[PDB]
Design a binder for this molecule. Structure first.
Ligand SMILES: Nc1ncnc2c1ncn2[C@@H]1O[C@H](COP(=O)(O)OP(=O)(O)NP(=O)(O)O)[C@@H](O)[C@H]1O
Length: 874
C-alpha cells in the first residue's frame, strides 16, 4: 500500500504552477520547463527528487534552486559528484551564480561555514564515517552524474553514502535519461523512508542530427525525430564503394567553417592521435589579432605563478602555439593547468576546433555546436570494440547548446570503407544504458564498520540496493512458483533427456571440425528436429560452417534409436511423406543415417529421371528398415552417450513434469545468489592474515588498514607494519609507494632501479603481494583484473621518476626520463601525497614517529611547482 517513490507522469502539467509557488527561492531569465517546475514544486513540499533528464534540458537549475533553499532556511546543501577533477569547476560555477559557498577537498579546504559545500562523494563518505558536526545542519544532498560509471574510479560510492545518511537529510539525484530510474528511486525511498519523486523529460530540447561524413559530403542518417534514414545511409555506402589522412581534417574543418557549424569537438580515443590530428591543421587560424592577444594575456596571467623552468615546458609552448590559433586538444596526458587553460578558453569562445578523448564528454560542462566521431570503436583493456549506446549518447549529447543552437550536429567519420549498418544502428540507436549498482565490499569498509560496531556490516548489506532488489524479486518468483506448483499438482526420462543433451553436445562438437563436411556430404539422409521439435527426415544439400546451418531436402513431422527394432516398432511407427522442400536447419540432427543419396540439384529441378529416382529411394527409406547410425572429444562424448544408452501418447505428462521440475528448480537457484558470501570469505581472509582475531575483534594491524582508503590496504599495511622501511630515505619510501597508484601499463622497457633499497623494496612488496594472493586463492575470493595482473604489469616503473622528483629535479628533467606523459606523472605524484598522509596517520597508530617524520618530509619534498599548481578555477 505504502509507496515512497512516485513517478511523475510526463503528460502531467502545472498550469497554476506560477501560483503554487508564492515566493520562489530563485527565478531565471527564461521560463522553466515542466520538469523543472515539478522538481521545484516537490522540493518545496519537503520531499526528495530523482531527475533523469535528457542532455541539454537544464538539470543544474534544480541544483541551484535547492541551494537557494539552503540560503533561505539557514540550512546546508552539500553538492557531490564522483568526478574529483570537476570539483574546482563546479565550485567556480556556483560562485559566479550565487553567495557564500565552500569547497572541501583532501588537502585544500575553503569557506566551510558556507550554506553550500562542494565536495566529492568520497569526501562525503569520509565525513560520514568521521561523524562530522556540520552534517547535523545539512538538509539537502545533491548526487550529480548518478549515471556515471567508471571501473577504474574508486569514488563512485553514492550508494554507501545514501545508506549512511541520517534520516533528516533529503536527496536530489541528478542523472541522464535511464530506463530503470524507478528501481533506484524506490530502493532509496523505501530504505530511507523518504518521499521521492521521479522526474524525467520527453526528449532533448536541443535536438540532435546524426550525419555521416563520406567523400567530402555530409549525409544525414538520423533526423531530429530519431528516425533512421535508410536511403541516405545506403547512399554513403554507395559513394564510398582506412582512417584519417593529412587532408581529412582540413577538409571537414573548412566545410563546417563555411557553414558556421563551429565550434567542433572531435572525439579521438588516443592522446597521440589527438595531437597528431591537431598538428594536421597546420596553416589554419581562427583568431584575429585582438583574440591572439587576449589569449596570450590569459595564458601569461594564468601561469605567472610557476617558476620559469615550468613556464617553458614543451607541452605548454606547444599548447600555446595551438591555442593562439583557436585550436586545441584535450586528454589525460596534459598537465592539469594546461587542461584548465584549454577548458576556460574553450568555454569563453576562443577555441573552434578541439580534439578530445572520451573523458572530456563525461564531467565537464562544455557543450559544443558540432560533435564529430573520428571512430565509433574504442579500445578498452579488453581490446577494440564498438562504443556502447550510453557512451555514444554521452559524447554525441554534447553537441547541442541550448539558447545558442537550433540543433546539435553530430557527425560520424567514414574514410575509405563504408560503416556497417548493424554496428552503426547498435551504437547510435541501441538500448539505453541502465543504472547499475556500484556498491562493493572492501577490507577497509569491513574493518572500519567492524571496528565501529559488530553488526554494522550486516546492516550496511541489509540496506544495499542488491538486497532490496532481491526483496523486490522474491514475491514475483513466489507467484511464478505458485502457478508452477499448482500446474503440476493438477530414470528413463533422466537418461533420455541426458541422451538428448549428449546428442546435442556431440552435434555441437562436430560443428567445429571441418571433418563434418565428410559426414554430411550431399545426400546424407538424416533425422532431425524442426523448430517445433518434430522428428523429420531429409537429405543434406548444403553445409555452411560459417553460419553453422545446413540446407536440407526434407518427410512431414511425426506429431527412435540406432538399431532398435522392437523399440522402433512400438515407439516409432511409419512416418509420413510430403512434397520435398529446401529447409534451413541448425546442426545442433538427432541421428545420421547410413543411407546416402547418389545430385539433389537435379531433384530441385524436378527432372523426371531424378524425380523417379528420388520417389523410389524415399519410398524405400520410409517403407521398411529402421534407422542405423553412422576427434577425441566426440569419442568420450560418444562413450558416455553409449553408456547412458546401455543404461507415443503417454510420455506427454512425464515430459510436462520434467519441464516443470526444470522451471521450478531454475526459479529456486534464482533466489540463492550475494554480498554475505563475499563478506564471509573476506572475514576468513582478514582472520588468516591477522587483521582481526578469531572473535572478529579488530587488531592493531586492522586499525592501520582502516586508515588506508586507496585500494591495497592489506599489502600496504603489511609493508609499513614492521621496520623494513627503517633504513629507507623519505625520497625512497615515497618512490617505492608509487606502485600502489600507478597502473604500470607503460609500453617501454624498465631501466635499472635507481637505488638498491628500492630494488629490495620492490622485491619485498612483490613477496607480500604473492602471499596475499595465496590467501585470496585459498578462500576462493574473486579478483579484479587489476588485482590479478598486478604483478604481471610494470607497476614499479615510476619509482625512478618519483625519486628524482623528491630529490628536487625540475619537471623538465623528470619528463626527459619519464616512461609516462605529464598528466600521469602528475596523477601519480599528487596521489602519493594522499598516500603519505594515510601512512602518517597509520604511523601514529603504529607508534612509529620516525616513519611519521619521514612521510611529512616526503610530502614536503614532492609538494611543489607545476605538479601542485593551484587550480585556475579557484
Ligand atoms: N528552462 C530553460 N530555458 C532556457 N534555457 C535553460 C533552461 N534551463 C536551463 N537552461 C540553460 O541551458 C543550459 C542547461 O544545461 P545544464 O544545466 O548543464 O543541464 P544539462 O544539459 O542536462 N547537463 P548534462 O545533461 O549533463 O549534459 C544552461 O546553460 C542553462 O542556462
Amino acid at each position: 500500500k505504502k509507496e515512497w517513490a512516485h513517478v511523475v507522469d510526463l503528460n502531467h502539467k502545472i498550469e497554476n504552477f506560477d501560483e503554487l509557488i508564492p515566493n520562489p527561492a530563485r527565478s531565471w531569465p527564461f521560463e522553466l520547463d515542466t520538469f523543472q517546475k515539478e522538481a521545484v514544486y516537490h522540493l518545496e513540499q519537503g520531499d526528495s527528487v530523482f531527475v533523469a533528464a535528457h542532455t541539454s534540458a537544464g538539470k543544474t537549475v534544480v541544483a541551484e534552486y535547492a541551494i537557494a533553499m539552503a540560503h533561505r532556511n539557514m540550512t546546508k546543501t552539500i553538492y557531490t559528484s564522483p568526478i574529483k577533477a570537476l570539483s574546482n569547476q563546479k565550485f567556480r560555477d556556483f560562485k559566479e551564480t550565487f553567495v557564500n559557498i565552500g569547497l572541501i577537498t583532501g588537502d585544500v579546504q575553503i569557506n566551510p561555514d558556507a550554506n553550500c559545500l562542494i565536495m566529492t562523494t568520497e569526501i562525503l563518505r569520509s565525513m560520514l564515517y568521521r561523524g562530522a558536526d556540520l552534517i547535523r545542519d545539512v538538509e539537502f544532498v545533491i548526487f550529480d552524474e548518478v549515471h556515471y560509471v567508471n571501473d577504474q574510479d574508486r569514488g563512485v560510492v553514492w550508494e554507501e553514502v545514501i545508506i549512511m545518511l541520517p534520516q533528516h537529510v533529503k536527496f536530489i539525484l541528478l542523472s541522464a535519461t535511464v530506463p530503470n530510474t524507478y528501481e533506484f528511486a524506490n530502493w532509496i525511498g523505501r530504505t530511507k523512508q523518504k518521499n521521492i519523486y521521479v522526474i524525467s523529460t520527453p526528449k532533448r530540447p536541443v535536438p540532435l542530427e546524426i550525419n555521416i561524413w563520406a567523400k567530402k559530403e555530409l549525409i544525414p542518417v538520423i533526423n531530429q525525430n530519431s528516425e533512421f534514414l535508410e536511403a541516405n545511409f545506403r547512399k554513403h555506402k554507395e559513394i564510398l564503394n582506412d582512417g584519417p589522412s593529412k587532408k581529412t581534417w582540413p577538409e571537414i574543418v573548412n566545410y563546417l567553417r563555411k557553414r558556421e557549424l563551429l565550434p567542433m569537438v572531435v572525439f579521438v580515443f588516443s592522446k597521440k592521435r589527438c595531437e597528431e590530428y591537431a598538428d594536421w591543421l597546420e596553416g589554419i587560424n581562427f583568431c584575429n589579432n585582438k583574440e591572439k592577444s587576449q589569449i596570450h594575456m590569459f595564458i601569461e596571467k594564468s601561469i605567472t605563478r610557476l617558476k620559469k623552468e615550468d613556464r617553458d615546458l614543451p607541452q605548454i609552448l606547444k599548447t600555446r602555439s595551438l591555442l593562439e590559433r583557436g585550436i586545441a586538444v584535450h586528454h589525460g596526458g596534459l598537465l592539469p593547468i594546461v587542461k584548465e587553460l584549454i577548458e576556460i578558453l574553450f568555454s569563453k569562445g576562443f577555441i573552434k576546433v578541439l580534439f578530445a578523448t572520451e573523458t572530456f564528454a563525461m564531467g565537464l560542462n562544455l557543450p559544443t555546436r558540432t560533435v564529430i566521431f573520428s571512430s565509433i570503436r574504442k579500445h578498452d583493456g579488453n581490446g577494440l570494440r564498438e562504443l556502447t549506446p550510453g557512451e555514444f549518447t554521452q559524447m554525441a549529447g554534447r553537441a547541442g547548446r541550448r539558447g545558442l543552437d537550433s540543433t546539435g550536429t553530430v557527425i560520424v567519420m567514414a574514410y575509405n570503407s563504408p560503416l556497417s549498418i548493424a554496428t552503426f544502428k547498435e551504437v547510435t540507436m541501441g538500448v539505453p544504458t541502465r543504472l547499475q549498482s556500484q556498491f562493493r565490499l572492501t577490507y577497509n569498509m569491513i574493518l572500519n564498520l567492524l571496528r565501529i560496531e559488530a553488526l554494522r556490516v550486516e546492516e550496511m548489506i541489509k540496506y544495499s540496493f542488491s538486497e532490496n532488489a532481491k526483496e523486490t524479486l522474491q514475491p514475483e518468483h513466489e507467484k511464478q512458483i505458485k502457478v508452477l506448483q499448482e500446474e503440476l499438482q493438477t530414470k528413463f526420462l533422466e537418461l533420455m533427456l541426458a541422451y538428448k543433451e549428449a546428442t546435442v553436445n556431440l552435434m555441437q562438437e562436430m560443428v567445429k571440425s571441418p571433418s563434418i563436411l565428410h559426414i554430411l556430404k550431399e545426400g546424407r539422409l538424416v533425422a532431425f528436429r524442426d523448430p517445433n521439435d518434430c522428428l523429420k527426415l531429409g537429405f543434406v544439400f548444403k553445409v555452411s560452417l560459417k553460419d553453422a546451418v545446413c540446407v536440407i531436402m526434407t518427410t512431414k513431422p511425426y506429431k527412435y534409436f540406432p538399431k532398435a527394432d522392437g523399440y522402433r516398432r512400438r515407439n516409432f511407427p511409419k512416418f509420413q511423406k510430403t512434397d520435398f522442400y529446401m529447409e534451413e536447419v541448425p546442426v545442433t540432427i538427432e541421428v545420421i543415417t547410413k543411407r546416402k543419396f547418389a545430385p539433389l540439384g537435379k531433384v530441385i529441378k524436378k527432372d523426371v529421371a531424378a524425380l523417379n529416382e528420388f520417389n523410389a529411394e524415399t519410398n524405400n527409406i520410409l517403407d521398411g528398415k529402421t534407422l542405423k547410425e553412422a576427434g577425441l572429444k566426440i569419442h568420450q562424448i560418444l562413450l558416455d552417450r553409449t553408456n547412458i544408452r546401455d543404461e507415443s501418447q503417454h510420455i506427454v505428462p512425464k515430459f510436462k513434469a520434467h519441464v516443470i521440475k526444470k522451471k521450478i528448480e531454475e526459479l529456486y537457484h534464482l533466489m540463492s545468489d550475494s554480498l554475505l558470501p563475499d563478506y564471509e570469505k573476506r572475514l576468513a581472509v582478514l582472520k588468516d592474515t591477522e587483521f582481526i582475531d578469531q572473535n572478529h575483534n579488530v587488531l592493531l594491524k586492522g586499525r592501520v588498514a582502516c586508515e588506508i582508503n586507496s585500494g591495497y590496504e592489506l599489502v600496504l599495511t603489511e609493508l609499513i607494519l614492521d621496520n623494513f622501511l627503517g633504513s629507507f630515505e623519505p625520497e625512497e619510501i615515497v618512490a617505492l609507494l608509487s606502485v600502489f597508484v600507478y597502473e604500470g601499463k607503460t609500453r617501454e622497457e624498465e631501466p635499472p632501479i635507481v637505488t638498491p633499497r628500492l630494488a629490495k623494496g620492490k622485491q619485498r612488496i612483490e613477496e607480500i603481494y604473492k602471499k596475499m594472493l595465496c590467501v585470496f586463492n585459498t578462500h576462493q575470493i574473486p579478483l579484479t583484473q587489476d588485482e590479478a595482473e598486478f604483478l604481471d604489469r610494470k607497476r614499479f616503473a615510476m619509482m625512478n621518476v618519483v625519486y628524482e622528483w623528491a630529490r628536487g629535479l625540475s619537471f623538465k628533467e623528470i619528463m626527459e626520463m619519464s616512461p609516462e606523459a605529464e598528466g600521469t606523472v602528475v596523477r601519480v605524484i599528487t596521489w602519493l601525497d594522499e598516500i603519505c598522509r594515510e601512512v602518517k596517520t597509520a604511523s601514529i597508530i603504529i607508534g612509529n614517529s620516525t616513519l611519521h617524520m619521514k612521510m611529512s618530509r616526503a610530502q614536503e619534498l614532492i609538494k611543489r611547482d607545476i605538479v601542485f599548481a593551484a587550480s585556475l578555477y579557484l
